[PDB]
Design a binder for this molecule. Structure first.
Ligand SMILES: O=C(Cc1cccc(O)c1)Nc1cccnc1
Length: 186
């Protein structure tokens, strides 16, 4: 099946807890996979204008680890719940992908999660301005604009709204697309 095939692919890239105890400032993100219309999608947030860091940017749900978190996956799930109402029974964490080093003192750990088909996002407007899906296959043939660094522009065909996706968020989306979609029979 599509979902069993995706999970099987993802597990081959799982680094697990290998880098998780290193003494960094620690953040986790959830890369949330949603199956709709017979295809996989990633769920993204647009950060609120209220926020201090990166107002109005597209990013995955996530945030800073706190003392309550049993592990880095827990960070991702707690933050996703706060941001978009995703409850833990609604997500299966499949793997931990390569962490992202930034600012010399920070390590961001990405987890891929399969999202239940009955989840409906409840954007928390103190943190999130918008929530939207992009088909995973888009990231194989993105619409690129150079700002010099590469920016993806995705237009939602449901409503014509264009979102800009860039940086770590864009990079991780392409990684997941490669992992899941490469070398597949039609
Ligand atoms: O803050 C995060 C996680 C994160 C950590 C590092 C980098 C990044 O792009 C994203 N996610 C969030 C926060 C508020 C609203 N929507 C998404």
């Amino acid at each position: 099946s599509m979902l069993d095939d995706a999970k099987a692919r993802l597990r081959k890239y799982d680094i697990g807890g290998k880098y998780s105890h290193l003494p960094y400032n620690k953040y986790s993100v959830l890369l949330p996979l949603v199956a709709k219309e017979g295809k996989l999608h990633l769920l993204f947030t647009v950060r609120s204008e209220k926020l201090r860091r990166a107002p109005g940017e597209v990013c995955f749900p996530g945030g800073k680890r706190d003392p309550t978190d049993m592990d880095d996956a827990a960070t991702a799930l707690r933050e996703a719940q706060e941001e978009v109402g995703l409850r833990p029974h609604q997500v299966e964490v499949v793997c931990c992908l390569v962490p992202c080093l930034i600012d010399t003192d920070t390590l961001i750990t990405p987890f891929v999660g399969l999202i239940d088909h009955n989840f409906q996002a409840q954007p928390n407007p103190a943190e999130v301005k918008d929530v939207f899906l992009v088909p995973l296959a888009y990231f194989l043939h993105p619409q690129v604009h150079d700002q010099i660094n590469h920016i993806f522009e995705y237009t939602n065909p449901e409503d014509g709204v264009t979102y800009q996706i860039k940086g770590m968020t864009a990079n991780l989306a392409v990684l997941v697309a490669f992992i899941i979609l490469e070398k597949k029979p039609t």
